[PDB]
Amino acid sequence: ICSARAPAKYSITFTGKWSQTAFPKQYPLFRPPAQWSSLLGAAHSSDYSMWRKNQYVSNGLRDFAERGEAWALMKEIEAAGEALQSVHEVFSAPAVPSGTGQTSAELEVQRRHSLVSFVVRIVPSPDWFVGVDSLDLCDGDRWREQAALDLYPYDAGTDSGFTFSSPNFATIPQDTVTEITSSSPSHPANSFYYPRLKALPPIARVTLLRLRQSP
Template identity: 70%
Template sequence: MDATRHIMSDALYHLMVLMLILGQGVQSMPVPTDVPMCTASEPAQYRITFTGKWSRAAFPKQYPVYRPPAQWSNIIGVTHSSDYHIWQHNEFASNGVREFTEKGEAWTLMKEVEAAGERIQSVYGIFSAPAVVGGTGQMTTEFEVFARHSYLSFIVRIVPSPDWFVGVDSLDLCDGDHWIDNLSLELYPYDAGTDSGFTFSSPNFETIPQDKITQITSSFPGHPANSFFYPRLKHLPPMAKVILTKIRKTNQIIGMPMEPTQSNQLPTGNEIEDNLINTPLDCEVSLWSPWGLCKGKCGESGVQHRTRYVLMHAANNGAACPMLEEERKCFPDNCL
């Protein structure tokens, strides 16, 4: 299963590279727009580094350890003008976003991006980077922005999950007549609104009618079974982050995705400190069972018991489990 998943990930990576090469002729066309635009005279090239911070310590509830373990899909990114959105908070996900967030399939999403470039000439560049085979790892690639296409959007699927993802929608990298040099953003989970599963490994359960894209928080959705439900927290820890760095322009129009290496799969630098985040997880127990039969001699008081069981054990100094068995005095019924 893992080998098959790795082959599919490689296939998606090479598909992205192929579409990036074939689409450059269309993507580089200028875009007329009435929106105030960036006035930078030259295009800029950026390096984007995505770092997963999805550790078991930070997100202990139902953390997936196998079939499949916690990991990240390929990043799919677009540089574009202000009139385009690959996804948007509080709006309905497209069919392409649905297939990508639920199944990791990018064909439809790529066709939607390609169509936007051809129809309204809003898309300037497409980029991708290989998947991260772990909850904490990195992927890096480069991309170029143009004055009339100064916005960056991207999406990364959370694997496994019903339809959850992290990403950025329409980040403008231009400030007046110059490009932003460096930028760091923390990323939090979103629900695409197409699947109603509550946990990372929930089976497919289509949302009918489809909901809009919403941000997942420590209290929303407010169901105790939800994998991100941490009522003691005001805010979830960041699940990932991206660092954007403007680099010196080269002759290459759009940087090709870099293959992952052992060094960029592991946390480096400040990531060691990030991994020390410990989210407390309180013990969760079931409801009490009905009281059992009263055990005792006729005419004398007896004892009856009820029990409950642990739904989820405490972690990271969370509240310990309460007692699981209780007894009370009773008087036997139907004594002869």
């Protein structure tokens, strides 16, 4: 029930927090070193879903989650806008070439498309990523000034590899998106299995800040 009179510009700042200190298990040091893919996202309405927990990822997202290929996903978003007018604009931020680091982009939301979603692939990984699914920046007739979120690893459900550098192994039948925790999947061989922790620490963080580039 958003009633925001005018659109609003926001800066989205992604912070990678995948350090060896925070996540020592099987930490990728070379060929390739721990890093992140480009950040791809969009401002949209509830009629469009880039991804959702417990839902199958689109072929476009599968390609992005497994190889950082963003073209098919970009075409899907473009097609969604043409078919259901569910997308205001697509945005992206440069990839972070290391475990820790930052990257940013500017986006615009409007009452009709006040939701923001984005995905960033964990490199290297079978099909693991982080992101936000339909964060609503509108709160009635006003735009939220700021949104700070902790990000946790997700499994696309397309590749069954157990570790960051595991060779490709298609998941059949295909599974749905699942959140990866310190206890699930449960096995010493799994990259994020830390039985001594109550929960995994955030692997990344993101901040949406309403910009003041005009009155």
